[PDB]
Every structure is written in C-alpha cells, then in structure tokens.
Amino acid sequence: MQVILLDKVANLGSLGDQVNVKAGYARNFLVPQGKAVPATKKNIEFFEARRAELEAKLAEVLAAANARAEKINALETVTIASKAGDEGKLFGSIGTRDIADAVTAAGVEVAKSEVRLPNGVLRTTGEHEVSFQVHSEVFAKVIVNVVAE
Amino acid sequence: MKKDIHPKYEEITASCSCGNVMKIRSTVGHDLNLDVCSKCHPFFTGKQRDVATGGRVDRFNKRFNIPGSK
RNA sequence: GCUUGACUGCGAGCGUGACGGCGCGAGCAGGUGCGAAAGCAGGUCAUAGUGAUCCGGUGGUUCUGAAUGGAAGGGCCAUC
RNA sequence: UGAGCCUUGAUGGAAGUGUGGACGCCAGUCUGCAUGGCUUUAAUGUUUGAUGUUCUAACGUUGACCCGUAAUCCGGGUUGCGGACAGUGUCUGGUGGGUAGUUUGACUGGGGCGGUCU
RNA sequence: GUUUAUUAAAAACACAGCACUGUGCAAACACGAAAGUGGACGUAUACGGUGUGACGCCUGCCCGGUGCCGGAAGGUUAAUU
RNA sequence: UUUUGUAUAAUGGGUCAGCGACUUAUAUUCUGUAGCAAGGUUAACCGAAUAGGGGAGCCGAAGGGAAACCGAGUCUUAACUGGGCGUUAAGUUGCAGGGUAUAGACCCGAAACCCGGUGAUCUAGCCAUGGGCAGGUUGAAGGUUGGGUAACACUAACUGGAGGACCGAACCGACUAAUGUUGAAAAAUUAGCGGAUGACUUGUGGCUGGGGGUGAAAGGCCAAUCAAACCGGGAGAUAGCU
RNA sequence: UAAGGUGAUAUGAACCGUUAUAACCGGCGAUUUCCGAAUGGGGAAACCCAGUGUGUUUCGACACACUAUCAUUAACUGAAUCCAUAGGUUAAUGAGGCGAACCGGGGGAACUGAAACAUCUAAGUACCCCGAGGAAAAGAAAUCAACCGAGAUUCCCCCAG
Ligand SMILES: [Mg+2]
Ligand SMILES: [Mg+2]
Ligand SMILES: [Mg+2]
Ligand SMILES: [Mg+2]
Ligand SMILES: [Mg+2]
Ligand SMILES: [Mg+2]
Ligand SMILES: [Mg+2]
Ligand SMILES: [Mg+2]
Ligand SMILES: [Mg+2]
Ligand SMILES: [Mg+2]
Ligand SMILES: [Mg+2]
Ligand SMILES: [Mg+2]
Ligand SMILES: [Mg+2]
Ligand SMILES: [Mg+2]
Ligand SMILES: [Mg+2]
Ligand SMILES: [Mg+2]
Ligand SMILES: [Mg+2]
Ligand SMILES: [Mg+2]
Ligand SMILES: [Mg+2]
Ligand SMILES: [Mg+2]
Ligand SMILES: [Mg+2]
Ligand SMILES: [Mg+2]
Ligand SMILES: [Mg+2]
C-alpha cells in the first residue's frame, strides 16, 4: 500500500503517490518492467533530488516522439495489395506486418508494436484504417489499401 | 520443503480431536516462482508465504544475496 | 381456631453397620408458634420414596491470593 | 446492488392574472418561473461487501516452435490456449468399515433364551 | 476350461452373451507423501466398476424404508468479521 | 500335585550325575540390638580417605483450625458452655530381621501387538526370449465343374482344408480303490482315470513384499510356515491361569 | 640387546652367527598383487574391456602412469538473442568409506499400566535417519529476587515425593 509510480498510468497517482497506494498489484507487473516503486525510505528521499533531468521528458522527450501523427499522415496512399482474390476475398494476411511495414516502401521504418486496432482487420481491400499508436501520449494515423493483381 | 528465503517447516505434530488423536500432521507452506530481478531478469525461486512477504520489506537482491553467498 | 418448630447452633448416652455411613436421642444456647397453665412442637403413626466421589454452576465471607495493592483463582458455609 | 462518511435537496429586488410537481380528515395550502411600473429520506463523490462482465500480469498448460543437444526427461526462450480460474498451504462443515483402536456385564443347578440385579 | 500344492474337482470360479452405471482424455479408476506410471502410444463401436452367465420364450406389481440421480426457492448450519 | 475326597483307572517322573526357583537396589514402617539423648544425625564434598573435617539439611521435643491465626491450647458457635482433636508417650542414627513400595521382584510358559531388515531358487500372477505335441479320425468356410436362374440364391459331386473338434503315446493333470500310515516316500507306489493345437505345456532370466503382493475366488499361494511370511529387536510383553 | 639363531602345530635338511650389523625388541622409512568408498568404463566382489602418455625395446610389445562424481576458485571457450547468461574444457585444492560407546539433531511405536478402555501410561523409550567432537551441548541475563539482594553455562547433595 506504498509505492512511487512517478510515471502515472490511470492510477490515482502521478509523479508517484506518497500516500497509501495499491498493494500486490505492483509485486508482479507495475514494478517489473513497468514503473518501479518501493516507497521505502531509501528510494523515497532519492525522489526528492529529482526530477528536472527526468521531467525534461514531457517537454523534450514527448517532442522527440510526438511528431509521429505529424511526420506520417500526408503519406502517399499505402498501396500494398493483400492478394485480393477468392471470388471476392483475399489471400494476403492482414495483421501486423503490412500495416507497419507499409512505410519502408520507400525507406523509413517503424515498429510493429505500435498498431492500434482491437479487432483483427477483416481481410478486405478497402480503406484499411491504421491508427498508429506509437505511444499513449501521442497517436497517429495511417492507412492501408489492397489492390488486384 | 523449500520457501528458500526463509527456512521452511515440514515438522510433524499430532492432530488431536475431542480429547485425543495420536495421529500425525506435517507438510506446510507452499510455493510459487518467476520473480523479476531489477538486474538482468528472473530465476524462479520457489518461496512461499512469509517468504514472499519477506522479499518486500527487504529487497529482492539481499533476498538473494544469501541463496548465493552461503 | 391460631399459626410456621418442615427453626439455627450443639448434644449426655445409645442402637446398627467391615467400612463409607445410617438411625434414636433427653438436655443446653438464641430466637419462635399454640395454650390461662402444666406443657407440646427440631415435619408427617412408624418402617420405602434413593446416588458416594470428581468436574463444575449460584449466593455469602476482607480465610487465602506467587514483588506489593487489587483481581482471577483456591478454602470455608449454603445450595444446584 | 446494499451499507459508512456525510455533499446538495424536502418536513421535523414591491402588490396582482397563470402554468406545473406536492399531499390530503378537503374543502386547501406548499412551491420555481413571465408581464406588470442532525435525524426519516432521495441523487453525485466516494469507502466497502456482493453477484456478474472483460483484460494480462502472477498461476496452469500431458499444444507448437528454438537452443542447451545428433535427449522422449529437465531448463531457458518465443508463440498459442486457459486466467485471477484452476491448483496448493492453513483453517472449517460434510461424508467416511476405505483403515485403525477398542467395547459389547454379572447371577444362572453347564451355558444360552427367559428372568433378576437398588 | 479353473479351484482348496498335502482329505472337497463340484451343482462352486471362469466363460462367450446380456444389462446397469461411470469416463470428453492431463478420462474415469489404480500404484504413489510427490515426481512419475499404468489405463493407452488407446480416445465412447473406447476404457472402468457392478450384477447376470450359451441359446430359446421371457423377465410382472411396489420408489413407502435405505442408497443413488436431479432441484435447491425457503428453514438449520462451520471457519471467518 | 490337586482336591470335600485319590491305591485310584486324575496330574508329573525310564534311571543316574550336574545345573534348576523369594534375590538385588533405594524408600517407608515395625521387631531385636548397639550408640547417644531433649536432643539424634549428617549429605555432597574436602581429605595427612574406612580417620578427621562438613550439620546444607532430615527427624523429634506442640498442638488445634480449611486458613489468617491462636497456642497447652485450639477449633466449633453470637456463646463466655459443652463437644472434636491435643496436653508430665523420648526420640534419633546405625546394624540384623518381618512387611510394604518402585522395579522383570520366586522360577518356567502363551496366543499376540509394535519397530527394522531378509525372502517370488517353492508357489500365484505377469514381462522378455527359446523349446514340445507318435500316430489314426472327422471333415466347416472358400473354390472348380455339371445342373440350373434373364441374374443370383439352390444343388451335386470333386478340391479344399477349419475347429478352446474326435480317438490316443509323449507331455500336463489328479476322479476311484487297494497298499503304505515308526512308509521306498513329511502326499507316493500299483491298477484304472481327465486334457493332449490349446484360456495348452515347458527351459532361462526378469517384475510385484507383508496389512503388503498375487489370486478363473479356495482365505488359496507368497521356500514342508499363511484369518496376515521369515529373521532380529522393543522383551524378562502381559499371564487374577497351570 | 646379544650368545645364540632360521614364527607354530613336527622334527629334520640346508644353514646364519659368538666382538661390535646373526638373531631378537623399539623408532623412522622402502616395498605393499587383486577386491573392497574403489575412483578410467563395466562386473554375478578378488574378473572383463578401453583411451591417452612412458621408458628398455631384437624397438609389434610389457607392464607401468593418468583418465569416477560432486563442491570452491582460476583461466580459457560459449546457445537460442547484441550483449550477458545457460552450457563446455582444463587445472589446484577438498570431499567420499569405515567407526564400539557417550553427544546434538530430524522421524517416532506397541506390548504395558489404568486390575476393562478411547483421555492418560509405557516414553520421547525402542527403533531408523543425519551430523560432530574428544567430549558434545549449554553459556555471560530482555535470569531470578522481593523493596534485601544474588549474579553465565554445566555436574553433585539438599528443598520434596
Ligand atoms: Mg404414614
Ligand atoms: Mg473393525
Ligand atoms: Mg491394547
Ligand atoms: Mg456368567
Ligand atoms: Mg471339463
Ligand atoms: Mg485337497
Ligand atoms: Mg480330490
Ligand atoms: Mg450366478
Ligand atoms: Mg473333583
Ligand atoms: Mg496315577
Ligand atoms: Mg538329580
Ligand atoms: Mg477430650
Ligand atoms: Mg480337443
Ligand atoms: Mg488305509
Ligand atoms: Mg497312474
Ligand atoms: Mg485324448
Ligand atoms: Mg523362473
Ligand atoms: Mg507353503
Ligand atoms: Mg518393555
Ligand atoms: Mg516371558
Ligand atoms: Mg575400476
Ligand atoms: Mg566402478
Ligand atoms: Mg489395561
């Protein structure tokens, strides 16, 4: 019931809660890989000396990662036919690759771990919407289209 | 059997009823594993309760600086 | 008719039991009731109507109460 | 969907014509709006107990793949499916001749049946 | 066909057949403190347990009692707070 | 010996020789005896070891009451009476003995329970790998051909060769009778008897362990042992019985 | 140390010795087949089979010597995955097995007694398992006392049946 997120995530706390927090929730998730917390003397005081060099992120880091929706929007139509066929269906697999890999059709590269589409995409050919989800802080927009060959 | 961080138990006892049973009791605690070390990453210790809660006030590191050293 | 002796505290001396125990009992002390009074009353005419101990329950008491003052608990008396 | 605090409500700018919700011992008043000169109790915040939803991240995997490795074991990794379930430990109600330890009297014209044990 | 080696060879055990019941596979069930193994490198035309005992014609009435199967609204009810 | 009672035809002993059963430890109490005496006596230990030293302590000279408490008195009761228990009983420490207590407690003896090991060279199942079955019989399914059907079925022969099939040696087993019964033999011999291509029979080796195994089931088998194996231990179990 | 002496059941044969390296006794060594923790692998124990090195070599060979497994450290190699680990190799240390009892500890009966039997007893005994020493164990108060004080543990006699 005592942690220090600092990196708020829907939790009733930001910059790290100094008062009664959740427990057992962090033992395996929050703390690991997520936002380490131990609100125990040692780690506590160490949070005070902070966090300009660590806060400069929301100003600087956010910027070095927010231009996403701006760097990639006017993009030329993504022309990656997904083997449209089968009397009106397709052959190509539309999931993670063609979505992201649709950018290095000229050079630029991305990470397949940023896609935003709950349901898998129906193997169509229409205006495959691709809401690029680089980071929670910033979302982008991409598209995908299938053609006949 | 383990609960490594802390000793363990598995000591016997007699489970009396209404007056008396000269029977025997024993095996306790439990297990679990997969503990993420802030350092590289998790080796799965099979601690148990009183062992798991111990890794908290303590460390994860000192809680391991023994199962190695000694 | 009037009442509460179906009293409380003791008991000379006896009877009867292997024992535990059981029974009879004049007389004494404090207070009673009935009788003018002598006096009678310590449950029923008598003999069956019963359960030892332990573990406890309830009330009473400065008996005791583990450093001391209390208390819990123990004793003692009454009773389940 | 209950309940605790308790947050906002109904009992305990100067006249007239009107509209709505309120309840009745009933003949009535309550109460917003134009022109006109603390408790009984409801909603939101919540804290917390319930069922039920979904998620991954503990946990399972006697699915697949990769190494250790010219292993069917095991471990690590990736991936899938399951998922706070399952299962385990402590505690607890069932059930429990599956097993175990025992009890199941005496008198008596043998014993047993019957009868009797003060 | 089997059985009491050493007093019983049988009408007893078994049998093929029949029926009930359980088991969705990490199966039920069994050995095992566990890991693991058998069942089975099988998967309901399969595997287990119970009873009947080729075959023929059949197998009637009772669900009160006990057991088992379903329900689980209401009553009673453990730890726990 | 045991009995009311035994020459008893109730028990025990063929005979001889040797061995064979009230002990031992500490505690408690009586008796005798010795020491000392309202006092008696030390324990461990020390030690110029049976001395001497050591009196921690144990017992007695006071008892009554549940106790506080009082005290040759004290409890009882409100009682100052009576009644209960006490009050001019010498104890104490050794030694030897009678008894008791805790112990194996005079000696011998169970059927059993518990703990840990040894056993599947017998036997019961099962696993792996090998072997055996003289001879004679019956003669299914399938097929060839003739017939026959529009085509089949159906049939006739011939071929064919099945079967927990038939008869019968080996082999396996045990229904009957005699003999044996201090046997040739701790289950057999003799004459018959059942199965004998099968749920058959057998060699070698392996796997199941005792409350456990295996079991076509008899509580059968698990080394001449089985309603819980053998060996060692708890163990001198316990034995109101002989 | 010494006149004898070559162990015993039996001499006997062949011998060694008397001065001081003959015996015989004591110390330190040398050797010490095969099996056995058995350790190179296997194995019905005292047997079977190999790898890698060696010397003498009439230069095939004989035997010899090393090579078990774990743990600590060292260095070198090193996966899925850059790293890093996992793993691997080598080497030096060390362990391993026996062992009578006492000792610490983990597990733990029943007969028996209670004149039956469940609480209770027997007894934490028997036993089985692990470990260590010459003793082990315990040990310098979060001890006790009772308003005075004592002063770690241990063992002995009392307190007391
Ligand atoms: Mg009368
Ligand atoms: Mg029974
Ligand atoms: Mg018994
Ligand atoms: Mg009788
Ligand atoms: Mg037959
Ligand atoms: Mg027989
Ligand atoms: Mg017979
Ligand atoms: Mg039948
Ligand atoms: Mg007689
Ligand atoms: Mg005679
Ligand atoms: Mg004699
Ligand atoms: Mg008197
Ligand atoms: Mg035949
Ligand atoms: Mg005869
Ligand atoms: Mg014959
Ligand atoms: Mg025949
Ligand atoms: Mg054999
Ligand atoms: Mg036998
Ligand atoms: Mg004994
Ligand atoms: Mg005996
Ligand atoms: Mg060797
Ligand atoms: Mg070897
Ligand atoms: Mg008894």
From Swiss-Prot, chain A:
The keyword ATP-binding does not apply. GO terms for biological process: cytoplasmic translation. Keywords: Acetylation, Ribonucleoprotein, Ribosomal protein, RNA-binding, rRNA-binding. The modification N6-succinyllysine is found at K71, K83, K112. NCBIfam families: L9 (TIGR00158). Pfam families: Ribosomal_L9_C, Ribosomal_L9_N. One of the primary rRNA binding proteins, it binds very close to the 3' end of the 23S rRNA. GO terms for molecular function: large ribosomal subunit rRNA binding; structural constituent of ribosome. This is Large ribosomal subunit protein bL9. Part of the 50S ribosomal subunit. In stalled/collided disomes (pairs of ribosomes where the leading ribosome is stalled and a second ribosome has collided with it) bL9 in the collided ribosome contacts bS6 and uL2, while it contacts only helices of the 16S rRNA in the stalled ribosome; the inter-ribosome bridge thus formed is different from that formed between normally translating ribosomes. One of its GO terms (cellular component) is cytosolic large ribosomal subunit. It comes from the Bacteria. The keyword Cytoplasm does not apply. The modification N6-acetyllysine is found at K89. Belongs to the bacterial ribosomal protein bL9 family.
Curated annotation (Swiss-Prot), chain B:
The keyword Transmembrane does not apply. Its cofactor is Zn(2+). PROSITE patterns: RIBOSOMAL_L31 (PS01143). Pfam families: Ribosomal_L31. Binds 1 zinc ion per subunit. Only 1 ligand appears to be Cys, the other are thought to be His and either backbone amides or solvent. InterPro entries: Ribosomal_bL28/bL31-like_sf, Ribosomal_bL31, Ribosomal_bL31_A, Ribosomal_bL31_sf. One of its GO terms (biological process) is translation. GO terms for molecular function: rRNA binding; structural constituent of ribosome; zinc ion binding. Keywords: Acetylation, Metal-binding, Ribonucleoprotein, Ribosomal protein, RNA-binding, rRNA-binding, Zinc. Belongs to the bacterial ribosomal protein bL31 family. Type A subfamily. Binds the 23S rRNA. PANTHER family: 50S RIBOSOMAL PROTEIN L31, CHLOROPLASTIC, LARGE RIBOSOMAL SUBUNIT PROTEIN BL31A. This is Large ribosomal subunit protein bL31. It comes from Escherichia coli (strain K12).
